[PDB]
Design an enzyme around this catalytic site. Structure first.
Site, PDB file in Angstrom:
ATOM      1  N   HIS A   1       0.854  -1.219   0.000  1.00 55.78           N
ATOM      2  CA  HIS A   1       0.000   0.000   0.000  1.00 55.78           C
ATOM      3  C   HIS A   1       0.881   1.257   0.000  1.00 55.78           C
ATOM      4  O   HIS A   1       0.503   2.238  -0.676  1.00 55.78           O
ATOM      5  CB  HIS A   1      -0.935  -0.032   1.217  1.00 55.78           C
ATOM      6  CG  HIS A   1      -1.954  -1.120   1.180  1.00 55.78           C
ATOM      7  ND1 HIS A   1      -3.307  -0.855   1.118  1.00 55.78           N
ATOM      8  CD2 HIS A   1      -1.830  -2.466   1.188  1.00 55.78           C
ATOM      9  CE1 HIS A   1      -3.979  -1.985   1.102  1.00 55.78           C
ATOM     10  NE2 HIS A   1      -3.095  -2.998   1.137  1.00 55.78           N
TER      11      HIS A   1
ATOM     12  N   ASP B   1      -6.214   5.128   2.972  1.00 58.33           N
ATOM     13  CA  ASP B   1      -6.245   3.659   2.761  1.00 58.33           C
ATOM     14  C   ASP B   1      -7.658   3.113   2.965  1.00 58.33           C
ATOM     15  O   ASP B   1      -8.370   3.529   3.927  1.00 58.33           O
ATOM     16  CB  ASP B   1      -5.305   2.928   3.720  1.00 58.33           C
ATOM     17  CG  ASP B   1      -4.829   1.590   3.176  1.00 58.33           C
ATOM     18  OD1 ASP B   1      -3.849   1.605   2.395  1.00 58.33           O
ATOM     19  OD2 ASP B   1      -5.466   0.541   3.506  1.00 58.33           O
TER      20      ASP B   1
END
Ligand SMILES: [Br-]
Ligand SMILES: [Br-]
Ligand SMILES: [Br-]
Ligand SMILES: [Br-]
Ligand code: NA
Lengths: 453, 454
Positions: free
Chosen positions: A15, A119
């Protein structure tokens, strides 16, 4: 006056790196880009920033938050999802990241940026940004296909109307016919319902509609039916701005220059991959038996005696870091054995390399369907069990592996897979260049953020 | 300490009255209910509260906000959507209500209620409530069918693949085949693109997914395909708790009706909100006389034929002003209801088991007319097909169209079947709101869910 976008990735390598690439794409349009991280993760960004800076490239700012490790009973050194091994540690890690909300809210109150890119794992970031009338974008770092598939499975639960482990069910409203079995889904969702994981997924997927919208690391031309399906059937506001790794743009490479075009298999499972001795042993035997030349990246009871000597001309084992992009883009590389994580899948697409798909967990079984059934640029190794643990029973055997290694190199449709992958490669580079779909959606998003009132 | 729910309706009679009824439904489950209004609208609530109180009924609190009329260039007296006639005035009214945000936020900070039920026309109320971790519910005051139809038209634009005013297109994903023309849609959406009205509808429909969910003044058994479609295909979290007007429910015109045959009399009432021009009223008068049908006509003398009232003395009754509408509609002598097919009116026809002549004008009314005529099959259209907030002389419905609809609803081929179908919906409506019914149940479920929210 300069637009300011704050990026808040979860502390997972998979990520963090694409989030940095998005921050860089924004920075190149004269947008102030700040990334929120923690002290033990900062080095990942500091290195990667400077190792792609000093070319007049704009400045990415870091903001450091304290990760409350002690508070949730994690080791002081555990500031990254990769270090949280075992059911106990993962749950504590998620409680930990949830306690960053106080710091996020104080930072937004103080800095008042124009947008928060947070996120997928922070559903609560939407409400945090709303407190200061700041729009929040969700970033997942996976395919449109996976975002659609997961959501149709969550809503329609097609797996409740089956009676065995291997019984095939169709994904319900999709424009392609996609069959799965329960084995390919996490055991919480299908066998013993566990509200924790189930509530987490519910809040993540709900954030996609509750937030301002979704930034997607994909290109429209890669998966047009799912870029549309996500926006139309599932009602998300989305921008496709990938592959984001194209933004900026040694002994093993000398070794490859000597070789025939499309003659070499690259095997690399990533940093997430936890490979047990018995599994590595079956790969070694399959590679020898396949006759195929190979570059095998590993992270010695697990090597057949005389392996290293027998493969001297044909095979290279790299322990640790490989220059992955430079290897995949070498003319000598004809195939890529991957776990089908989205970052790896996108690098195969960008290099125009067909893939042997080895899904393990997360969204990987959906990515495998995209690669094999829709893009038709891959061959499955035959792993069908979703697991974050490696049981000896789930090891893929030499014969299954050898069959896939042979098929991807010399099987009947191997050349067709290479031709199809080469087309996607050209389309990927065209998406990210001025006038391309990804360049364009990035312009459109920024324009829309500039005009938000 | 009891659960507290704040209700924040837009200043329109059609939203205020159903919101009061919801506040009363909540109050009866021991929930503290407050309604936000403005000074010139408070009388609507004060009257209606006391005219249904003095029976130990739980107490609805009012909070008054200042409406910034001067600030947006409206007359001081213009605190209601009904007073905002003309393109200029309506736009200013919406800017005005948008400037209530400061007062809403100060009120929520001060009171910290458990839930905000805010009008569809306040999309920003979601973020206002979120500032204090308060869940926001959206209330529209319309059918599931309308909520679904508007959204499928907005997203799939079936009208863009058309070449003329009157060309029929189907509503896209619906399990019924529903044909409409551009004429039936607001002129901003289809003819001359105006981002203002278009941005307003976009933010309203988006609020349905961004908010905690949607309260709906309908019952499951009335429109099951659209109660499901709204929640499944369109992904809304919704509770059906209506008809909310049944909550409170356990002179000369009624004496007049006792003399009449069952299902012999037409009731005509467009409401107090209704703006009717003299030429239109004149065509209704002539149609009623020509139809030969007995009638009770509620009007809010240039628009009456000379000798009208005298010629119809046995057959027709004109009431000027307040009528006991419920008592009239529930009288055995009443066989039809001529309405604008706004949802409050449509639901009272359903609750009385009375077939309807549908006369849509604007808002969601052409969608409600499709539900009534094509899905419920309890109505007949007058043949108005033009969406308009203005009544131009050119758009008046003529005597012949009106007479045709008055005859059809009383003696047309399926008149009996429409009456039978409407009587079934009546029974289903009362069953929905009684203990154990779908609407009683969804209201219990919503309150339980609000009680357990963190
Ligand atoms: Br596709
Ligand atoms: Br496959
Ligand atoms: Br229905
Ligand atoms: Br009709
Ligand atoms: Na949908």
């Amino acid at each position: 006056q300069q637009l300011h976008v704050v990026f808040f990735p979860i502390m997972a390598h998979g990520h963090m790196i694409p989030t940095l690439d998005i921050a860089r794409l924004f920075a190149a349009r004269n947008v102030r880009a700040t990334i929120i991280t923690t002290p033990l993760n900062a080095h990942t960004f500091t290195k990667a920033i400077e190792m792609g800076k000093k070319n007049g490239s704009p400045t990415i700012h870091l903001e450091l938050f304290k990760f409350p490790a002690q508070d949730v009973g994690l080791p002081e050194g555990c500031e990254n999802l990769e270090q949280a091994l075992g059911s106990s540690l993962i749950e504590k890690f998620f409680k930990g990241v949830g306690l960053l909300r106080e710091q996020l809210e104080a930072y937004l109150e103080k800095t008042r940026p124009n947008c928060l890119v947070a996120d997928m794992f922070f559903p609560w970031a939407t409400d945090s940004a709303a407190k200061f009338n700041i729009p929040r974008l969700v970033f997942h770092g996976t395919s449109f296909f996976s975002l659609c598939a997961l959501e149709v499975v969550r809503l329609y639960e097609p797996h409740k109307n089956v009676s065995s482990d291997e019984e095939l069910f169709s994904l319900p409203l999709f424009p392609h016919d996609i069959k799965m079995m329960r084995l390919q889904l996490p055991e919480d969702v299908w066998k013993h319902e566990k509200a924790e994981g189930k509530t987490r997924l519910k809040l993540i997927k709900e954030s996609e509609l509750k937030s301002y919208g979704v930034i997607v690391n994909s290109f429209y031309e890669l998966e047009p039916n799912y870029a549309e399906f996500f926006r139309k059937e599932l009602g998300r506001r989305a921008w496709n701005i990938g592959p984001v790794s194209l933004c900026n743009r040694h002994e093993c490479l000398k070794w490859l220059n000597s070789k025939k075009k499309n003659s070499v298999i690259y095997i690399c499972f990533g940093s997430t991959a936890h490979q047990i001795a018995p599994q590595l042993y079956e790969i070694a035997m399959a590679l020898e038996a396949s006759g195929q030349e190979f570059i095998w990246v590993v992270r010695d009871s697990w090597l057949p005696r005389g392996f290293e000597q027998r493969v001297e001309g044909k095979g290279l084992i790299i322990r640790g870091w490989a220059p992955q992009v430079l290897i995949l883009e070498h003319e000598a590389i004809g195939a890529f054995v991957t776990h089908c994580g989205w970052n790896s899948t996108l690098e195969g697409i960008t290099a125009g390399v067909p893939m042997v798909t080895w899904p393990i967990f997360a969204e990987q079984f959906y990515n495998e369907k995209l690669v094999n059934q829709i893009l038709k640029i891959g061959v499955p190794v035959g792993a069908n069990k979703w697991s974050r643990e490696t049981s000896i029973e789930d090891v893929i055997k030499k014969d299954a592996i050898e069959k896939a290694l042979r098929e991807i190199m010399v099987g009947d449709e191997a050349e067709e897979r290479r031709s199809r992958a080469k087309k996607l490669k050209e389309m990927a580079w065209k998406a990210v260049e001025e006038g391309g779909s990804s360049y364009s959606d990035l312009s459109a998003l920024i324009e829309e953020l500039r005009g938000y009132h």
